[PDB]
Structure 1
Amino acid sequence: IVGGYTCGANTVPYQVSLNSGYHFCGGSLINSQWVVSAAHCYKSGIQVRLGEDNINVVEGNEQFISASKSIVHPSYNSNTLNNDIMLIKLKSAASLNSRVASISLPTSCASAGTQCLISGWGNTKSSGTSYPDVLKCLKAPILSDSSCKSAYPGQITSNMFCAGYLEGGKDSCQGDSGGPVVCSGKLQGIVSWGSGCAQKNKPGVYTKVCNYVSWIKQTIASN
């Protein structure tokens, strides 16, 4: 997260860290046994870490649970990043509490202009590299469909939406990948892609979760 703020320990209870010997992606807890992340974050040997703030220090509220199954969307296209969503099932149910909680899935898509909360442990530099140990947060508005398509000609599908600031300075970045974009208390987006970080006229692009609720529900209903 570039140009954001320190969230505050466990203030984003649904935020998870995907670990494969190190933090490599974010994710969102949608219920005690399932996590929603980006399909491009896929890899084997994933351990889901919940209740995390500083990912390099055991602070006492964490829950480490290995993934038992990963399900990348059937139509995920890594070339275009269309359908960049993946479900991860935990080997065991997480113990839900005040610091580890699920985030509700949307019933309707978010409206352009809505201010959402983006979070993660990704790069905090626009030009250069610096990874925080504690969770970072960013308040960012959903940009217009028109502005999004103009920023990335011929690359924005109906399963994507842009959020951020065209003037640059505030954006998600490498490492926040797979993380949440919450608007009005609903998981409306997944940190997916963009062009660099916090660059002018190049806002972050996010997977439009509201288009996948049927697939998510059917999938967790049979797995």
Structure 2
Amino acid sequence: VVGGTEAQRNSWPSQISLQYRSGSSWAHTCGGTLIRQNWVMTAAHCVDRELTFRVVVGEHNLNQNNGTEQYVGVQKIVVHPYWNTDDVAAGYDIALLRLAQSVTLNSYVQLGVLPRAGTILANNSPCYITGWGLTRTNGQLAQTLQQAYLPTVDYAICSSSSYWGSTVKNSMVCAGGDGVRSGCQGDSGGPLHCLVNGQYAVHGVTSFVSRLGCNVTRKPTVFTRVSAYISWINNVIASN
């Protein structure tokens, strides 16, 4: 997250770190949201690679023991059937991971609350992106979980020529684009939390930013719109 601030350690208890085995150690690769005790929602493009993955819940600092982490292997990966790795702009950038064990809930580990199906945020709605991604374009991952305030940019605007044009679809949410704050590599698959009727819900799964850099004016960060996939998510979980 570029232009972010350190999160309080109990602010976003549904945030997870998806990590992959790198030699004798593990490395953060993207984010995700805990949606059942044994299911995680992330971006399809995060699990394109044939790696060994684990999920870490209750994580705050990637490089220090927090005393709150639970580490659980990934048992099954279900990517959206329409996903196409070389066409991120076509959408369907979403995947569900079934965990090897069910995690225990506490003040650091809670299920993410999903929006009702079909819900679309009005222009300029207050949202936070969270994650451990790069803190500057071509920079390095954050140590501690970061959060940035990113107001939504509605489809009519985001799909105009000076923003994203045709690349953005109705199945996506855009947020930010002020040129100071944004998502960045390592944030993919992580949540966009939006305050609706007094309750934060996860409205987006971070999907892409501009190749021209993370925080670019009028290239808001693009998220998969979770409310477009409520039935898909239910169907996968019900059949696994």
Please report the TM-score for the alignment, with normalisation by the length of structure 2: 0.89
In structure 1, list runs of 5 or more residues that go unmatched: none
Residue equivalent to 1:148: 158
Indicate yes or no: 2:62 matched with 1:34. Answer: no
User: What is the CA-CA distance between 1:78 and the residue it aligns to?
Assistant: 2.1
Indicate yes or no: 2:118 matched with 1:106. Answer: no
What SS does the aligned partner of 2:133 have?
A: coil
User: What is the CA-CA distance between 1:123 and the residue it aligns to?
Assistant: 0.6
Whole-Å separation in 2 of the counterparts to 1:8 and 1:115: 18
Task: Give, as a single letter, the amino acid of the residue that structure 2 aligns with 1:120.
Answer: G
Residue equivalent to 1:119: 130
The 8 Å contact of residues 10 and 52 in structure 1, kept in 2 or not, is answered as no
Indicate yes or no: 2:216 matched with 1:207. Answer: no
Whole-Å separation in 1 of the counterparts to 2:11 and 2:168: 32
Q: Count residues in correspondence.
A: 221
> Which of structure 1's runs of 4+ aligned residues deviate more than 4 A?
none
Residue equivalent to 1:72: 79
Deviating more after overlay: 24-33 vs 179-188: 179-188
Residue equivalent to 2:29: 24
1:1-223 aligned within 5 A: 1-20=1-20, 21-42=26-47, 43=49, 44-81=51-88, 82-108=91-117, 109-112=119-122, 113-126=124-137, 128-150=138-160, 151-165=163-177, 167-184=178-195, 185-195=200-210, 196-223=213-240
Whole-Å separation in 2 of the counterparts to 1:200 and 1:140: 13
Task: Give, as a single letter, the amino acid of the residue that structure 1 aligns with 2:181.
Answer: K
Task: Give, as a single letter, the amino acid of the residue that structure 2 aligns with 1:164.
Answer: G
Whole-Å separation in 1 of the counterparts to 2:38 and 2:221: 29
Task: Give, as a single letter, the amino acid of the residue that structure 2 aligns with 1:72.
Answer: V
User: What is the CA-CA distance between 1:28 and the residue it aligns to?
Assistant: 0.2
CA RMSD between the two structures: 1.2
CA deviations on 1:3-40 (whole Å, 9 max, x unpaired) are 11101223211000001020000000011011000000
In structure 2, list runs of 5 or more residues that go unmatched: 21-25
Whole-Å separation in 1 of the counterparts to 2:82 and 2:229: 11
The 8 Å contact of residues 15 and 50 in structure 1, kept in 2 or not, is answered as yes
Whole-Å separation in 1 of the counterparts to 2:168 and 2:40: 25
The 8 Å contact of residues 32 and 191 in structure 2, kept in 1 or not, is answered as yes
Whole-Å separation in 1 of the counterparts to 2:209 and 2:133: 14
The 8 Å contact of residues 132 and 141 in structure 2, kept in 1 or not, is answered as yes
Task: Give, as a single letter, the amino acid of the residue that structure 1 aligns with 2:201.
Answer: K
Identity %: 39
User: What is the CA-CA distance between 1:79 and the residue it aligns to?
Assistant: 2.6
User: What is the CA-CA distance between 1:80 and the residue it aligns to?
Assistant: 2.6
What SS does the aligned partner of 1:217 have?
A: helix
Please report the TM-score for the alignment, with normalisation by the length of structure 1: 0.95
